[PDB]
Nucleic acid binder design. Structure first.
Ligand SMILES: [K+]
Ligand SMILES: [Sm+3]
Ligand SMILES: [Sm+3]
Ligand SMILES: [Sm+3]
Ligand SMILES: [Sm+3]
Ligand SMILES: [Sm+3]
Length: 341
DNA sequence: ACTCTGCCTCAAGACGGT
DNA sequence: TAATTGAGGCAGAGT
DNA sequence: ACCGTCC
């Protein structure tokens, strides 16, 4: 993500944040960062500090949420396409190594609480070690196929390919919490689109054109702003936060110019700073071709979903059948069958 | 006064009967 | 064979 | 809407 960008928008560019009722999105298509939704379910969907699972010990929390949340979206006429990450870019390797440190230390502190018969400490580092695996992604892809819900494999970061689907008009918005989707150029970003019966947070749209207008920037200047704020791909400047970062971009436009005019003794830049390379990655990321695959929402295969979710993963047959019926009727009401001419 | 850093914590789902 | 993110809150120090 | 339960 971008450190503090959502807060900056809310304070400087509030006009870019628009809220609408779930009832207004009937018929709209959205792109979803699948990995983040899977992670949300593995973290939250716990029963007694442990995850849901079948008797074979195979985890099912990700299948639980993917199934029901996706159905709820379709009942509201919202048609999602799930986008899965691919090979991370090299620039992320500098940050990937720093993540393993946190997992290594979280593992060290895990067995410590275990050998110490702790209770709340076990549930503390356990959730901190959660991670989305290839088997998590493959099982969700398998589920979506049976549900008739489309998905796409991005060549690199899913966030970037979601944005490219919006640019191309193949979906209305990227439904995510990772604000760096705007840094990748997404015209629209939607938060809090869960279609949950609770309705605790309002559906927010972030319109990039509004952000650029109220900040007085173009896209390249907005990317440099996000770099100074803090991105996954390179270092920021120590002592330059969201307040000074805005004033500098608005005044000097480019980081290259900010360095020329900054006092090297007062605000020294990082050593071997890759702000140019991250700039190139945000503006011209490796993305799928939106014109290659035509997004279709298809009839779900009920009998295979029962065999998979119930026979194998041990979901309630009554609940799964009911879910597939809802999914099939809601698709019939929001989706036109294919026509030939 | 304003701003930034480095700490700290906390939460992160959904169904169906009541 | 995976590497969130986000939001606040607080004290303390730099501008 | 609350809350035990989901697997
Ligand atoms: K910084
Ligand atoms: Sm990201
Ligand atoms: Sm099995
Ligand atoms: Sm990602
Ligand atoms: Sm990241
Ligand atoms: Sm089995």
């Amino acid at each position: 993500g971008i450190q503090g960008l959502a807060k900056l928008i809310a304070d400087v560019a509030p006009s870019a944040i628009r809220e609408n009722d779930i009832k207004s999105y009937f018929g709209r298509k959205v792109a979803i960062d699948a990995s983040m939704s899977i992670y949300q379910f593995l973290i939250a969907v716990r029963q007694g500090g442990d995850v849901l699972q079948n008797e074979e010990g195979e985890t099912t929390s990700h299948l639980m949420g993917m199934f029901y949340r996706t159905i709820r979206m379709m009942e509201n006429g919202i048609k999602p396409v799930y986008v899965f990450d691919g090979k991370p870019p090299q620039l992320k390797s500098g940050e990937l190594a720093k993540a393993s440190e946190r997992r290594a230390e979280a593992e060290k502190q895990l067995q410590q609480a275990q050998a110490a018969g702790a209770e709340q400490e076990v549930e503390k580092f356990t959730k901190r070690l959660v991670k989305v695996t290839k088997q998590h992604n493959d099982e969700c892809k398998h589920l979506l196929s049976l549900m008739g819900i489309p998905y796409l494999d991005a060549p690199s970061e899913a966030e970037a390919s979601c944005a490219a689907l919006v640019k191309a008009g193949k979906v209305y918005a990227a439904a995510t919490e990772d604000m760096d989707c705007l840094t990748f150029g997404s015209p629209v970003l939607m938060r809090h689109l869960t279609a949950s019966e609770a309705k605790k947070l309002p559906i927010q749209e972030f319109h990039l054109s509004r952000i650029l207008q109220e900040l007085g920037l173009n896209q390249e200047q907005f990317v440099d702003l996000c770099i100074l704020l803090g991105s996954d791909y390179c270092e920021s400047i120590r002592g330059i936060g969201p307040k000074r970062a805005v004033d500098l971009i608005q005044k000097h436009k480019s980081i290259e110019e900010i360095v020329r005019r900054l006092d090297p003794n007062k605000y020294p830049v990082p050593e071997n700073w890759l702000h140019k390379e991250a700039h190139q990655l945000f503006l011209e990321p490796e993305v799928l071709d939106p014109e290659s695959v035509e997004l279709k929402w298809s009839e779900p295969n009920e009998e295979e979903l029962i065999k998979f979710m119930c026979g194998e993963k041990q979901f309630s047959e009554e609940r799964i059948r009911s879910g597939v019926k809802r999914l099939s009727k809601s698709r019939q009401g929001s989706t036109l069958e294919v026509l030939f001419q």
